[PDB]
């Protein structure tokens, strides 16, 4: 019963804590080497290069924890106008957050992120005032209007997801990149009353140029309009499936035809939205029906989406920082070894002996500490990054 998204938020809390401990350690470590380097009583027990390295790791690590804290999952929706992109987003949020017409109405992107506040509001580029919501939106060289919405009202925003609507793929496809390469999942919202178009196809090819292997979903929306016809429904679906498959598996072969079953859904976002928005009254009603089978299909989509995006986003957003921290800790271990050795070797003795043995001792506590943080990084990769 617990959202797969929890995985990412859990990971973010873990990696955050580690890089705090880690920055704390390298700072302490850096003061030491500096102390030892600058000591006049000492002859090269620690070098200036030793110091500079440490100071560099300190100034680095400091900046990594900053960017970690600002990291979220991002899903991006595309579709011809009136395919139902905005409805899908609203259905996932359980409320009419985005109004029908956007971003055809506005001709720009609309992100939806959570706020810790309790009032919704808008924010544009190069400005930090909080315009009142959509109220002032039909108004608001690319273009982005960020919608904030109370975390207390949507689970997905509470759990670090950001949702983006495009203006519909009803030109161009180079200026969007300004919004996209952050994205962990791209969703093609298709109109099931009509067929997969090339203008739709064409935009995902450019994503599949640039991004290495992007996670792509296809939602065949408006599925209600082909309903109530059990034998018609099933032969129609087969034809949409086969063209949807042919676009994922072969023309963008970014998935094989068995993993692709878990990438393609038939869905009625309007049905799901109405059903969800009604939870203030305790059930009436839907459009054709059919309607329980559709609503389950949307829920299976949600669950798979959330498995996919959480796991993908942890890899591409946390793994390399972890690798970088392993290499950092290894170089620091080396530097303690180097100081410790230089110190039993006298150089790189009355009571000088006793200053040196204290230096040896500090370096070993530091090295031992590098080793705990190493252990915490492996424990991290074990829980959040296997295999
Ligand atoms: N019958 C039906 N209508 C839908 C569905 N999804 C959206 N709509 C309707 O289609 C129109 C436009 O949908 P919208 O989400 O605003 O399209 P967008 O421009 O891609 O954002 C509105 O009348 C919606 O209520 C659906 O699954 N079934």
UniProtKB/Swiss-Prot annotation:
Residues 250 are annotated as: G5 motif. Residues 221-224 are annotated as: G4 motif. GO terms for biological process: GTP metabolic process; mitochondrial fusion; mitochondrion localization; positive regulation of mitochondrial membrane potential. Keywords: Coiled coil, Cytoplasm, GTP-binding, Hydrolase, Membrane, Mitochondrion, Mitochondrion outer membrane, Nucleotide-binding, Transmembrane, Transmembrane helix, Ubl conjugation. Residues 165-168 are annotated as: G3 motif. A truncated MFN1 construct containing the GTPase domain and the associated helix bundle is a monomer in the absence of bound GTP and a homodimer in the GTP-bound form; GDP cannot replace GTP and induce dimerization. This is Mitofusin-1. The chain holds residues 4 to 364 of 741 of the full protein.
């Amino acid at each position: 019963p617990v959202s797969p998204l929890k995985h990412f938020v859990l990971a973010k809390k873990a990696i955050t804590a580690i890089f705090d401990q880690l920055l704390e350690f390298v700072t302490e470590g850096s003061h030491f080497v500096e102390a030892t380097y600058k000591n006049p009583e000492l002859d090269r027990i620690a070098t200036e290069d030793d110091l500079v390295e440490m100071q560099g790791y300190k100034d680095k690590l400091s900046i990594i924890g900053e960017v970690l804290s600002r990291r979220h999952m991002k899903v991006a929706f595309f579709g011809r106008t009136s395919s139902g992109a905005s409805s899908v987003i609203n259905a996932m949020l359980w409320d009419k957050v985005l109004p029908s017409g956007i971003g055809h109405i506005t001709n720009c992107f609309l992100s939806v992120e959570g706020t810790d506040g309790d009032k919704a509001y808008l924010m544009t580029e190069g400005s930090d005032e909080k315009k009142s919501v959509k109220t002032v939106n039909q108004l608001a060289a690319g273009c982005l209007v960020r919608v904030f919405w109370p975390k207390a009202k949507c689970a997905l925003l509470r759990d670090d997801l950001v949702l983006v609507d495009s203006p519909g793929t009803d030109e161009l496809d180079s200026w969007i990149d300004k919004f996209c390469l952050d994205a962990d999942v791209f969703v093609l919202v298709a109109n099931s009353e009509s067929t997969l178009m090339n203008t739709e196809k064409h935009f995902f090819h450019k994503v599949n140029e640039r991004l290495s292997k992007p996670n792509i979903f296809i939602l065949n929306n408006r599925w209600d309009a082909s309903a109530s016809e059990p034998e018609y429904m099933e032969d129609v679906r087969r034809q949409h499936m086969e063209r949807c498959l042919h676009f994922l598996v072969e023309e963008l072969k970014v998935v094989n035809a068995l993993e692709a079953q878990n990438r393609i859904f038939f869905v009625s976002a309007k049905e799901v939205l109405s059903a969800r928005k009604q939870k203030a009254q305790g059930s009436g009603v839907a459009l054709a029906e059919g309607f329980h089978a559709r609503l389950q299909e949307f829920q299976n989509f949600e669950q798979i989406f959330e498995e996919c995006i959480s796991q993908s986003a942890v890899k591409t957003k946390f793994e390399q920082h972890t690798i970088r921290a392993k290499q950092i800790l290894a170089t620091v271990k080396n530097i303690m070894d180097s100081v410790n050795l230089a110190a039993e070797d006298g150089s790189g003795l009355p009571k000088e002996i006793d200053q040196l043995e204290k230096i040896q001792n500090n370096s070993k506590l530091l090295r031992n500490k590098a080793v705990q943080l190493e252990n915490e990084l492996e424990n991290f990769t074990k829980q959040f990054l296997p295999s």
